[PDB]
Amino acid sequence: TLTRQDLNFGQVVADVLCEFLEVAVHLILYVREVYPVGIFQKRKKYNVPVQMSCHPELNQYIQDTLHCVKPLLEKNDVEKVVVVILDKEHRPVEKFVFEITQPPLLSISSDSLLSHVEQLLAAFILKISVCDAVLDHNPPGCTFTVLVHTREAATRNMEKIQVIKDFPWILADEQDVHMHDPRLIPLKTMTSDILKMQLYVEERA
Template identity: 45%
Template sequence: MCRHQAVKQYIQNVLTSVTTVLEKAQLEQVVFVILDASHHPLQRFVFELMLPATRVRSSDNLCLLKLEQELRAFILKINTSDAQLTSIPPDNTWVVQVHTSQAAALEMQQHQCVQDFTWIPADDREISMKDRQIIPLKAVSCEVVKVCWKLTDNKQYYSVAEHQYICSSINNEKMQLFVEESGKNE
């Protein structure tokens, strides 16, 4: 749970600003990236979203109930994983990246929901990880949505046993937008 008011507001602004692309099923990933002092990614917590092109009908209540239960378990997994995480050095920072199509990114910029909260293209060094290991953490699937939570770990910096931690101190807040060209995947 976050106690820092500026971080809470930042997360609220992220969620509010991606609403347009989320409602149109154009949001592919939201990525929480932990960066070292040189702004190279150490870890990437990736939330992949696969939404149907059409809205859910009210007759799909059973599916919505299942989705609510799965998402509750998903959030509980995130919340309880905090106990297993180790601290990281204070010189690290973090960013949030949104992966979407270029057209959706432009629309997000044009229909900015939150004033003074502009997304910028991410630096290449903050996106790529040369020697990485992908660790699936949790998946939620039903007719309405599919969500996958995974960790991409930079093996160059950490051993397999050290891949479970998250940034608890914030040195730098930076808004990111990563526009993924069609056909390119992680």
């Protein structure tokens, strides 16, 4: 396995990341109390406790969002997937940044993602589970959205609306993309043979 393309053309990493992002997003929504705790049930993933919503439409929304993220991952068009927490005025208060690098060549010397996927991804999940300790209290009535930072260069004349797998997406406006000099809180970094991923939170200063 010399190359990224050897792992089913990026499909393996995309699938593993989408499975991971779904569980991480649910856990974020729980620990930050974006939704009432009563919709979340306790499950196990990566042999560690996780908290997953049983609300059908919220579930489907998260899945639909990640269904759009998957092809972007496969074509190596993702630098970040960000869970953005918005206050009641719709201003970012907090961002959970999953910064992803998929180099074209596998790093020979790093540990095998696929042999240790449980342990490696569990470590992120465990940091999310207890992150409420290190973050500020969010104001009441927060919502979330998901921002995808792509590898694509912006062109002068580009349509704001971009349809992906039949769902309309939009170029993110400065209200969401910009936080004024946020405080950066590191949670976890991993370098594996196939994937480099860093999780950190940006909080409003």
